[PDB]
Paper text:
The [name]-dependent kinase [name] (DDK) regulates DNA replication initiation by phosphorylation of the [name] double hexamer ([name]-DH) to promote helicase activation. At early G1 phase, when the DDK ([name]-dependent [name] kinase) and S-CDK (S-cyclin dependent kinase) kinase activities are low, the origin recognition complex (ORC) together with Cdc6 and Cdt1 load the Mcm2-7 helicases onto origin DNA to form an inactive [name] double hexamer (DH) encircling dsDNA to license replication. During this process, DDK and S-CDK, act in concert with various origin-firing factors to convert the DH into two active Cdc45-Mcm2-7-GINS (CMG) helicases which then serve as scaffolds for the assembly of bidirectional replisomes. Compelling evidence in budding yeast has also shown that the essential role of DDK in DNA replication is to relieve an inhibitory effect imposed on replication initiation from the N-terminal serine/threonine-rich domain ([name]) of [name] (residues 74-174), as [name] deletion can bypass DDK function.
In our structures of the free DH (more than 90% of all particles) from the two large datasets of non-crosslinked DH-DDK treated with ATP-γ-S, similar EM densities were also observed. After multiple rounds of local 3D classification of this region, we finally obtained a density map for the DH with an obviously structured fragment nested on the NTD-A surface of [name]. The map was resolved at an overall resolution of 3.2 Å, enabling us to unambiguously assign residues 132–153 of the [name]-[name] to this density piece. The [name] fragment, largely in a loop conformation, wraps around the NTD-A of [name] and extends to the subunit interface between [name] and Mcm6. Its N-terminal residues before residue 131 appear highly disordered. The N-terminus of the structured [name] (residues 132-141) forms a U-turn loop at the juncture of the OB and NTD-A subdomains of [name]. The C-terminus of this fragment (residues 145-153) contains a short β-strand which is parallel to the N-termimal β-strand of the [name]-NTD-A (residues 176-181), leaving the connecting residues of 154-176 in a highly flexible loop. In fact, two of these DDK sites, T140 and S141, are located right in the middle of the structured [name]-[name] (residues 132–153). It is likely that DDK phosphorylation of these two sites are important for preventing the [name] from binding to the NTD-A of [name] and facilitates its displacement by [name]-M4NB.
Numbering used by the authors:
A (entry chain F): 101 to 199, 260 to 433, 441 to 467, 498 to 763
B (entry chain D): 176 to 733, 739 to 784, 788 to 853
C (entry chain 5): 2 to 110, 129 to 223, 233 to 304, 319 to 340
D (entry chain G): 189 to 564
Amino acid sequence: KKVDDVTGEKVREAFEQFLEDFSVQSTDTGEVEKVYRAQIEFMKIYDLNTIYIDYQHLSMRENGALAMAISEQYYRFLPFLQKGLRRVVRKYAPELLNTERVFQISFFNLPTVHRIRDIRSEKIGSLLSISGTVTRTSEVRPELYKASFTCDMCRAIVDNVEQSFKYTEPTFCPNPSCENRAFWTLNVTRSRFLDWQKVRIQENANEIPTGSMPRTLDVILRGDSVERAKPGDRCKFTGVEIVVPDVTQLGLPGVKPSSTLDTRGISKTTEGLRSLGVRDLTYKISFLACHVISIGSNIGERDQEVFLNSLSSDEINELKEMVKDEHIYDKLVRSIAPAVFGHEAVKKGILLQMLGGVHKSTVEGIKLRGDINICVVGDPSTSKSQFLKYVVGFAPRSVYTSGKASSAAGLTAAVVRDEEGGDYTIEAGALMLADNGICCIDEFDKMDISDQVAIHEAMEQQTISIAKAGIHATLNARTSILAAANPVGGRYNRKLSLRGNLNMTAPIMSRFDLFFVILDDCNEKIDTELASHIVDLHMKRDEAIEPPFSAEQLRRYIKYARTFKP
Amino acid sequence: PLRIIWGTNVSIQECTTNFRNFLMSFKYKFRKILDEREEFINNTTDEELYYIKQLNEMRELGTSNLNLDARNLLAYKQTEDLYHQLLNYPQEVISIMDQTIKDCMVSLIVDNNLDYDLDEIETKFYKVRPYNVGSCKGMRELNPNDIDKLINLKGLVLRSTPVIPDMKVAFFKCNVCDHTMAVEIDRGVIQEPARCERIDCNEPNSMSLIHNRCSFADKQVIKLQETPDFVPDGQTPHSISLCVYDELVDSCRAGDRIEVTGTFRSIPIRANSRQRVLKSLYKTYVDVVHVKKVSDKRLDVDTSTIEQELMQNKVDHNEVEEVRQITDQDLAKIREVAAREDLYSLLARSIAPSIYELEDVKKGILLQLFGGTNKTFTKGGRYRGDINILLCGDPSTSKSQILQYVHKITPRGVYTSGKGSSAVGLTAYITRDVDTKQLVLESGALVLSDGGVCCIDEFDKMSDSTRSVLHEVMEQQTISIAKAGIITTLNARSSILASANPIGSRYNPNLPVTENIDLPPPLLSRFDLVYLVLDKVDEKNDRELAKHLTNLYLEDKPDDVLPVEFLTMYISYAKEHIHPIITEAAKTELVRAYVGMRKMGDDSEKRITATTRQLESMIRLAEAHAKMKLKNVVELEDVQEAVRLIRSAIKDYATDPKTGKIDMNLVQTG
Amino acid sequence: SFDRPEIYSAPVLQGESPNDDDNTEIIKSFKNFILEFRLDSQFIYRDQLRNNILVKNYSLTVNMEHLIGYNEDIYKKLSDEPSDIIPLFETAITQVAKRISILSRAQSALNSLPTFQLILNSNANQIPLRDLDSEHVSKIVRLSGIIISTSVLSSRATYLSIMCRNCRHTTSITINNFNSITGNTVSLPRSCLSTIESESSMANKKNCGPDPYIIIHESSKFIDQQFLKLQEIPELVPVGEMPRNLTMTCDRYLTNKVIPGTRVTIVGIYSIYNSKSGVAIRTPYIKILGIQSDVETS
Amino acid sequence: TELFPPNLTRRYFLYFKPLSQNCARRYRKKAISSKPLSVRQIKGDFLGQLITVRGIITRVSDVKPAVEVIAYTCDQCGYEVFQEVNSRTFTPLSECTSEECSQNQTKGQLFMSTRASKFSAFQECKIQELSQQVPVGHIPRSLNIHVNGTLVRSLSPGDIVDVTGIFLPAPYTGFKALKAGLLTETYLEAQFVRQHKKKFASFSLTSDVEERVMELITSGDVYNRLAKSIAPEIYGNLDVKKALLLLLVGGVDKRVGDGMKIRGDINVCLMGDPGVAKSQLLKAICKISPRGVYTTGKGSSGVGLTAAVMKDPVTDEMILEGGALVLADNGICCIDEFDKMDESDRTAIHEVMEQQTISISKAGINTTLNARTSIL
Ligand SMILES: Nc1ncnc2c1ncn2[C@@H]1O[C@H](COP(=O)(O)OP(=O)(O)OP(O)(O)=S)[C@@H](O)[C@H]1O
Ligand SMILES: Nc1ncnc2c1ncn2[C@@H]1O[C@H](COP(=O)(O)OP(=O)(O)OP(O)(O)=S)[C@@H](O)[C@H]1O
Ligand SMILES: Nc1ncnc2c1ncn2[C@@H]1O[C@H](COP(=O)(O)OP(=O)(O)OP(O)(O)=S)[C@@H](O)[C@H]1O
Ligand SMILES: [Mg+2]
Ligand SMILES: [Mg+2]
Ligand SMILES: [Mg+2]
Ligand SMILES: [Zn+2]
Ligand SMILES: [Zn+2]
Ligand SMILES: [Zn+2]
Ligand SMILES: [Zn+2]
């Protein structure tokens, strides 16, 4: 008979008591309602597969022993939680279990969020919450969950075989027709699968240490959490730190562990006519996420109705009173980039670039561009880069790029080879991470000719075409461009035209809607006020910045206003 | 009789007794007698028991790591053999030392009858980290008889692999009866069970390994660029892969100069992945025991840069120090020297004693070493007090020696040359690893210089395209890369210290200052200080320079200047503990001076016009000057000194406002 | 053009604690029994082995009750599993005789010593031929009777040198078990052993073929083997039945010791061979370990 | 008994010094070991012989531990099992082959002991045919040298050398389809190394050098005599030869306690009209100096002067192979046609003549390498 884990049974009993006994006081009335019984009731009506469990709700039970036991040994205790949830659903809502369905337990809101570099080997198989910027995503693929196998000699099939990561075949063979166990055949027609996606995440820009490059991690989403991660945004993944076989550690220094078969209780004879099966144990750390939440790519859905149902009463009242103001345009203009003194025209252009125009498609088939492109040219130290830093730190889905550090494959899209294999993958470039956003490019003049050609192809066509290697594709690049460029010779020559001062090509010049030329003129009162503003900023930190609108309400107004089609 | 471990000359009983007597009977006066320092011996420091105090403070702090100096083992007479046994046989002797340390931890609390519980001492694993094991001979000068021996390597970290879980305990579960058991590793080999352990179930090949239930340990591989003290004829520097384990993982970042002591290993490498056939030529690496990140000859790393790294070090209990410990007496001496009336001239004079005069240049270098304070916004912005200096001038004005001194004195700077450096080599690149055959990201010179000073010699010889990279580093102290492999923004808070020559390789007074410097206004506006160093021929100046430069050759080994160790610790303390702020009186002087030079620039390019970046350079230089004198506020005197330094670096007093020319004989003073 | 890398060993540490069931400890206990046994006041077995070596008789005669006298554990191991313990005792005898023979020809003024033969006799209870059952299989039994016929001496191979047909790889096979009947427990290898050894650095797809080795007879060593037929005595046989008999195999110095018709008690292993009357039925036979003649004809 | 063999108890390495040509001339002996051969003249009939090859060393591998016999320990029996290795690759032992385990039913498991096994310091060197040994219109060939034991680090690139060793065959490395029979590769297991130009750092004040130095001193006027004998073919240019002799000698390098250094090497330029034999003087200085590299202003490019990253297959690692300035480290580097150089080479020399280092920050490596050339 099978032996049972007493700790696992206690964890299962505590979890099934927690699911049916936990309740909170209602905010509006004060009623004592059980949130997870209501969660199962909600899942029953809409035929959902996943249940979301808050971590502090689990932690406040007992003295915190159940939450610690689940968090430290999540891989071990996960099937016990699954069968406890199955028992609770069977007792309350038996109609869920018929469709046997796969239940996904999603934990969220952990007390501490760890970096990628704080991931250690002592937390393998434990509940964790990490964060990172998604750089690549994979196609949704089926993963063999409950395989079906036919024995070769039996020619009789067996069902419901659990698959634990690497591909396994049962050796039980309950049919007594044969006497062999190893030989089996897999039938994918009646086998059972799960959703599987592998998204690659990277360290956040502020989390990178002093001299090191960011290190990536392949985090895997299964079930309902698939396709909640998008390339180019910061996401918080809650899940379990798992371990994956790795072959690349063959040439690394150090004693690599190996697994030799133990031969002590095996009787042998020297009859004649000595080989053994030994395998290397080399591994790497991966993450298996159960809950994905996308935090803001900033520091802090086209229809208007679906956006307005998202906001509550106080926030929508703030939106209405902000719209109701007759001087709303001046407030919007003076609220853009409060650290920059003056340059009201550039702030107007940046605000209109954030708002943008509508996209119209002509009956014959051509598309009219609704994105507004801004180019800022002028003298050195005229706060041209401050605007671009403000835009990338404020506007969502915005990326900041240097002209010299960029590349043709880096700006649009790259075809990259992984692990010296036959498979090639597409990594999104700067114009794709800024899709329906603003791509900020300082030193556009320092960009060479080839990258300028590669970027005006995406400016004119609004698409990126890939024909490298065996990959052919057409990707979307609907992106407004905010460029900052210096004139030839550094200083802006007033005697020449705009085309004479700029070395960038004519297809670049023809697609910029607004050119803002900023000139440095030495006058007493302007220089005095600017110096007072700068030294006051340095003295007063954030107290010298007093915009009419905060960043969050400005973003809310921008999102509300982008729904309208004039 | 006497029992000896096979293959060694190490006896466990003799080594334990000798190390115990060393622990309970060592005084630092023995170390000073060994080092031939008799008049440096004092009363209250050396006469106390050193290691007994260290174990007492380890018990009080709850730590479990002892840093052992092997030269101290040489100092004690009974352990003079043990030192050799530590060098020859680290594996046995270090374990013997760990057992002796645990025994002494038990003894210190059972003998003195403390209230500390014995169970916490028993459950804790105490380990020792020996360092300073000998001279830093290069790894290419090592021999196959040096395998499994403690060695020192001073080097620069280039990159490091992510954390690798290596298996320690393996977890096996039966398929039919769910019987689970764990087996420990034995010298890298795990004996997987052929049959089930239970008497009820004995099915062969029924035990399967669960990769997630079993426990692992941390292992990291770090690529170190060795910089040995002695380099043979025609030898090119190489890189060593060195392995750190457990707590030492992620203790070393890319671009720092560290002193790694560890045992010298060699393992065979499989020729193919599918086969078990091993290569006869072994692969050598270093199994790291202890890492030293602090040097008295140079400054410490910036504490504002590694705050989250410091908190992670506190969490991981690695107990490696990134900054030097400051006692009470040397802090008192710091407070005493900060009260000197000639503190600015004393600190500037003590920078480069071998370099004669260049007082204003040394003052600027000193202010750049101090730097302005770093203000990060609560909203999300960041202002970095990094001072950038250009040294344009005549040949042989000892500017390249100034770059050498700054490169040696900084924690993690990188020295580079014009026309020998590229944009990709300055930002980041993708390389092929020799161990994994994988594409890895490696840092450029600007990223490796973050938190330090990037020294660029012969700045005029650099290409315009290569110099175009520097703009974002000078302005925002970041590098925003969008390439095929890297699309991110990397912090590069490196102060740029550049050296340059005029167009004709010598300053020509007929041509103006801007044409002589020959830099674009966007690049020249980002330099906080621009030092025009000139060669004016004089009688007394040439006589004094010749006497100073000839007095070095009087003997084989060459006013009052501070020692380099005290200067480094004073600058480090001032950078760490002083964050000056600007007052209204300083604000008035800043605005007045900025507006005054903006008005002066109206006269008729040929002349350096004033810039908003010059106002920011004024603020940074004033804040650095206030930080030097240990003041938490920036007063009017600091701003006046910053303006005076800015004017004197460009020789504005000698320059004519209209024509932009510089006259040598009239206004310049040598 | 390099040679074979060589593998050699040397004892350094104590290792794990020895076990009684270990083959080395059984051989050591057998050597101790041979060297240290005293019947009344003389070491009979070492003197017998010496006198056997001078007369060039490579065998030892050991009474089984002496094992009761010395060590019962090795006696029970030898009685339960004789096929696993008799080679160990022969190894002990030849290990003693190797150091006896070296000290002899260098003192009483090349030579190869074969594996010595264990001949062991006993005076214990005599199992009748009709009382042999299945629990005596692969065990030492003592049984008496009268001999019908002794076959001619067949030539078995002890040491044989072989060479590959085309590969020309030389190999040597030493055989120390000749007690099998109707079946080749030891035969020539099915494939060439040059490939698996990888003895040469060159290693010059090449296949030598199935069964490529041929026996080089002028460098091979052979011994003699005899088949005996033992019947129960005709005086004690039920009236209406033919008397039953058993086939026996003897080798080396046990051949040509008895003539047909003599009455002998024989110690031997009751064992099994398959002859090609029941789905799984095996013909029993006796591996003769010693022959004792009750009466000696004139 | 089973004892440790003598191979496992030897603390010494044995080498065969070739007999000199003079001693063979004294006693009417004709020795093939004494006569230096080029790499073209070493044919297949010289295999197995102790022969001397004359040539320039082009590439020297890093010293690595090449195992000859591996020691395994067994916990079951306590024996140490030693497995010899004489190939480029080996397979390890898994089950114990000692007599106690071989006789027993339960076999022990072997674990490697690196300290108890026997290693050799191993280097692979490439020796190239000299310019005067190559026939008309041919490319110089190369030969492999295996340096083992205490002879390691005695060969450095760019050294004119006589290497005496045993010409031995090796297993075939190459395409299987192109081999005909039992083809073997060749290498020269080095036994003795003779330097044509003795290094200045290896100088020792022995008894033999003392009498010759004293004779040269007491001959009188050592400075003028050494100056006139640099290039006796070139008439005149007494001051030029004097400063070239000072270039060869050089000044005293200075190290100051603050860490900065002042170079002791002199740099000399010879600018003049054609036909004044300055190229001949440069070639003469290259011949005199033990580490002399002669370069052309356009013949040597930027990558040929500073460094380049390359893969070493014997050690299987990427290493930085230096240029001409690296090859002439602690020696005189002679650059003919200095006015025809491009700006990158001018920049490299511009840094080298003062700093005595090259700082390379490219996509390959971010490093600083020592180049202490005295530049002519
Ligand atoms: N109008 C302004 N308002 C506020 N700060 C300003 C203004 N003009 C300049 N500054 C400051 O002066 C510096 C100018 O930096 P940048 O924005 O990089 O100049 P720039 O206009 O981008 O010219 P380049 O192309 O970088 S040379 C920053 O520290 C700004 O904060
Ligand atoms: N004022 C000085 N004080 C001390 N040493 C000096 C001084 N002026 C020149 N030297 C020395 O003269 C030599 C000239 O080398 P450097 O001054 O380092 O060259 P440089 O100043 O970088 O000018 P370059 O290289 O032609 S751009 C060095 O050994 C200096 O130490
Ligand atoms: N003073 C001299 N004594 C002896 N031979 C001389 C003298 N001057 C010139 N020659 C010879 O004239 C020839 C000139 O050859 P080079 O050494 O190439 O002269 P050069 O100065 O190098 O000319 P270049 O390469 O255009 S600078 C050689 O054969 C020299 O041997
Ligand atoms: Mg800018
Ligand atoms: Mg210089
Ligand atoms: Mg010439
Ligand atoms: Zn079956
Ligand atoms: Zn079981
Ligand atoms: Zn064959
Ligand atoms: Zn063994």
